[PDB]
Homo-oligomer: A and B are copies of this chain.
C-alpha cells in the first residue's frame, strides 16, 4: 500500500504509492530504490548498479537495503547425486557422489 510496518520489505518490482498514484517508491532491477514524483525521479538511494534484493523495514528500527547473498567459489559439480564432503587422513579433501568422486583437492 503506502506503508511498510516492522518486518515488511520491498522486493525487486515491489512498490509503495501515494498522492493518487502520482508518487511511487519502487525497488528497481538495476538495484536503485527510487521515489518517482510524476514524470521525474525526486530521490533515490543511489544503489543503481548494485544487486539489491530487498528494502526491509527491520524490527530493530533500521530501514535497510541489502545486496543478495552470492556464490563466490564452488566445486562446479551441480547435477551430482548424494554428495558428501570428506576431509580424509591422506590430507585430500574429496567431494564424493553417487558415481564416485566428483571433485578432488589433490
Contacts and interface: CB of A to CB of B under 8 A. Distances in A.
A42 B33 CA distance: 44
A82 B18 CA distance: 21
A71 B82 contact: no
A43 B83 CA distance: 21
Nearest to A44: B73
Contacts of A8: 85
A39 interface: no
B43 A105 contact: yes
Nearest to A95: B63
A3 B62 contact: no
A78 B65 contact: no
A73 B60 contact: no
